[PDB]
Amino acid sequence: MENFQKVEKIGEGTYGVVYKARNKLTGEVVALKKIPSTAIREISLLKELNHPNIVKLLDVIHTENKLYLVFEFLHQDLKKFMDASALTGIPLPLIKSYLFQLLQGLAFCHSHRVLHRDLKPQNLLINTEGAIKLADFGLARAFVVTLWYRAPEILLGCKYYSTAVDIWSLGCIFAEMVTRRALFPGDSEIDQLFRIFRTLGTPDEVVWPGVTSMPDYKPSFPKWARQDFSKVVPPLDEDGRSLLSQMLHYDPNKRISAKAALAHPFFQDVTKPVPHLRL
């Protein structure tokens, strides 16, 4: 860490704290995260996971039984941009571009069976070029935090969940980009699940085989009718509703995979517009 001058505290987490920082040697501006043993082999292997849509891990520094991950630095995150554009809302060609690239990113990690596990708008970093990247990828396998984006399999006690959880999270963020409100803003675990249920219907065994046998499934969960996406994300168009729908599927094995969403007719006219930032 002695090769770094900390320019500014740019955030906070549960793993540790993040600082903008200038490399005494290279001059590079980087983001420094200040955070045992198989954490190192798991972190060092993500260093080999490079993609235009993943915030690049530049270096991992092990000293004093403290760990530091120097990442490439992007100036803004999605949550900040979203609060910034609350009165007009992100234009749809820009939402669609953001979504396309994010799914490209996830298409890549998911190939390697790496998953993010904790996507939320504060982990998605954007630049004035109109690019958007995933930050904190793979940090979870190693090693108030919101549940807003948590897939219901995780909420219901699945130990061994899959890449589909990232597709669930992405769907929630996509709904939020379009509507300008979080889709399922739970304040605790059961309110989170019960919010999911109120919109998309309590899952049963017809929509989700095996739902009733999961650890934290109770037969006594209330039973809500499903609602129409025409009421959930107006005025997103039918391609968008169709896509969103497939990304919020209860059955993790029926949920659309990133690779497959990429071929959806929603992205048929996808472009690459540049944001109006002020970062």
Ligand SMILES: C/C(=C1/SC(=N)NC1=O)c1ccc(-c2ccc(S(N)(=O)=O)cc2)o1
């Ligand atoms: C690299 C990195 C992060 S963020 C995170 N949760 N984990 C990281 O590694 C990073 C780089 C730049 C930023 C970042 C984050 C937030 C902001 S904000 N919304 O302007 O305060 C500006 C920049 O985070």
